[PDB]
Design a protein around this ligand. Structure first.
Ligand SMILES: Nc1nc2c(ncn2[C@@H]2O[C@H](COP(=O)(O)OP(=O)(O)OP(=O)(O)O)[C@@H](O)[C@H]2O)c(=O)[nH]1
Ligand SMILES: Nc1nc2c(ncn2[C@@H]2O[C@H](COP(=O)(O)OP(=O)(O)OP(=O)(O)O)[C@@H](O)[C@H]2O)c(=O)[nH]1
Ligand SMILES: [Mg+2]
Ligand SMILES: [Mg+2]
Lengths: 161, 38, 37, 161
């Protein structure tokens, strides 16, 4: 059972995976190179599930590999930064790329990360909820720093398999 | 009868095996690239 | 013959392991070069 | 059926594999990084065989991986340069490293490469043949540039399986 994390640079893809796998957080930013791999059989929701996690690079040099993995993964998590308008606009790109490899044969989740920065917010919740229904995919806002809705995220994905 | 799930799964371990070597090639040339502009 | 499928699968997973190890070493080598830039 | 090429830097490991896989040769030197992988189907003596080839780095940074692969490979080819005395002395290192991972449960071949440079030779054939018997491993001199004894090499290795 495979998942792939897509999105612009420094939105919090690497961070959301850490908050989930190890329940930790690091303020120090490190750009993901290539495609890191993490796996944990999280016995999620009154039953057992094995999850493969592919952490893609928001970095532009290391994107050639991505399409090949989208084709291999049964689920896609598209992440944006609510304090960054561009990273939100670009979520259209990443969903297009996914529709191209799997069409409707895929589960997709839009994620508005960094809710703990509500002060510096540029994207509203309505714009996010609207866009999600627009492209017919699930939606949820999270904070990897605060641990908010990070478990909720994976729990909802396992409930749609 | 279970000698069946052994194939579909083996081919997955070989599919993931393929993409690994692809990422490896890309990394290596990236290293060679950085060393040139040194 | 559902036997040779295991000994061989574990070999494809053994080679799979060492690949990811080499990948990790390469990535940090990249990060290292970028620092001394 | 797996093989691993060990030896000092620029002895001709990468070159011997090329002369065999593609029957070509390149004068331009490129240091092997990490562990390149090559595989090809050789039909020998009434049955078609399969060879995995691991090209290790003579480079010192990229050696941490080596031990893990020696453990995985059923055959080891230790290569030295006959116009370089040091690279010959160091073959003791590489055989020790192999005995450590597999003891006597491994086929080992010592190789004295660059015979086309007989003028600039520093190591004699006797020193090589002597050392081989000394450490109880096979021996053969080759030239990857000239194509000399390169097929002979792999043919003798397949005959000891
Ligand atoms: N305040 C706040 N900061 C966050 C949050 N999530 C991530 N960050 C910070 O934002 C930066 C995001 O870095 P990454 O987690 O690597 O994000 P990324 O999308 O994987 O970036 P790449 O790996 O280059 O593609 C890091 O410095 C984090 O510390 C969050 O929920 N709240
Ligand atoms: N004259 C002559 N030159 C050779 C021969 N074999 C290799 N060379 C040259 O010697 C150098 C050897 O380079 P490599 O083949 O990469 O040797 P290596 O052991 O793999 O070195 P690393 O990959 O860094 O570990 C190259 O420049 C070759 O062109 C040979 O048989 N005769
Ligand atoms: Mg990332
Ligand atoms: Mg080499």
């Amino acid at each position: 059972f495979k998942l792939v994390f897509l999105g612009e640079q420094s939105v919090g893809k690497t961070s959301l995976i850490t908050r989930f796998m190890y329940d930790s957080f690091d303020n120090t930013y490190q750009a993901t190179i290539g495609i890191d791999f993490l796996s944990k059989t999280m016995y999620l929701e009154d039953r057992t599930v094995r999850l493969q996690l592919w952490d893609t690079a928001g970095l532009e040099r290391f994107r050639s590999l991505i399409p090949s993995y989208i084709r291999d993964s049964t689920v896609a998590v598209v992440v944006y930064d609510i304090t960054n308008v561009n990273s939100f606009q670009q979520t259209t790109k990443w969903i297009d790329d996914v529709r191209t490899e799997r069409g409707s044969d895929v589960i997709i989740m839009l994620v508005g990360n960094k809710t703990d920065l509500a002060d510096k917010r540029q994207v509203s919740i309505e714009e996010g909820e609207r866009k999600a229904k627009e492209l017919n995919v699930m939606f949820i806002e999270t904070s990897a720093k605060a641990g908010y809705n990070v478990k909720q995220l994976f729990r909802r994905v396992a409930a749609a398999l | 009868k279970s000698a069946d799930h052994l194939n579909g799964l083996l081919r997955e371990t070989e599919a993931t095996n393929a993409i690994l070597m692809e990422q490896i090639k890309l990394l290596k040339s990236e290293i060679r690239r950085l060393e040139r502009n040194q």
